[PDB]
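Run: sequence + A1IZJ -> complex structure.
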Amino acid sequence: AFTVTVPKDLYVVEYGSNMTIECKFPVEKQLDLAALIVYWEMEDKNIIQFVHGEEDLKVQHSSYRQRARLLKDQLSLGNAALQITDVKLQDAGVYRCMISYGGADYKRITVKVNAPYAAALEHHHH
Amino acid sequence: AFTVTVPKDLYVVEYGSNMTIECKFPVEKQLDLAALIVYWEMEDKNIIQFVHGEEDLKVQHSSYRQRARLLKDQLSLGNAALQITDVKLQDAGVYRCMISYGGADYKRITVKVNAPYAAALEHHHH
Ligand SMILES: COc1nc(-c2cccc(-c3cccc(-c4cnc(CNC[C@@H]5CCC(=O)N5)c(OC)n4)c3Cl)c2Cl)cnc1CNC[C@@H]1CCC(=O)N1
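>> structure
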């Protein structure tokens, strides 16, 4: 039974920081890269599409462009780790990691973003 | 490139009717049932979990008990059709069909439920 797990289903991050959110999947000693698909989304927006051992950047949502990547050196450990740089208030929400590696499963992770007044005021208006 | 498609991304259904919502996936020549996974959810409620050519009812949300099924004769034609019997107002929302058949993809379907006053009043009080 193929199961994705999360060490944390909640992250609380500061505006302007970097965050790495993690999804674990079973890898028995050697990764079959050809079989692996890793997909991350939030609110139906494509963040990562990792297929055939490479990230496909073409259909990544504009909000994550040049700010989101998969840490590929974690995949051999069975860790799908999404790193987002320079966190914004619009990054708060529910993320899903969808993994195919023989079997298929997904998990949800909630991200909360703390921000000072000036950042919040910009978000509130625009 | 493995792609799931939907003939309709919107269904408008009457309270008390039956609905069948459809996701299509490519099947060339013959279906390899052992490789197929079909999952249906709405709002994080597990509806259908079809793996190893059988439904796993243990993880199904209680509100879909004896009221939701996957039309298995459709699968060899590349149609994942979810039938829900006796539609309620709680069935309105966004559904996802997630399919693994070599590759993996999903699609969203929106369902709107029309209901008369009496049914709406019960739902409103709940
Ligand atoms: C039967 O059992 C279960 N099956 C699944 C499941 C089943 C099949 C496949 C997948 C799956 C896997 C990997 C990737 C993708 C995928 C998705 N989207 C794209 C979209 N890209 C752009 C394109 C264009 C826009 C768009 O709309 N599409 C993509 O890139 C093409 N790849 C997917 Cl769908 C999953 Cl996750 C999950 N959960 C349960 C099991 N119940 C769930 C519960 C919850 C906790 C648990 O423990 N269990």
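>> summary
Chain A touches chain B through ten residues (CB under 8 Å). The first helix of chain A runs from residue 117 to 125.
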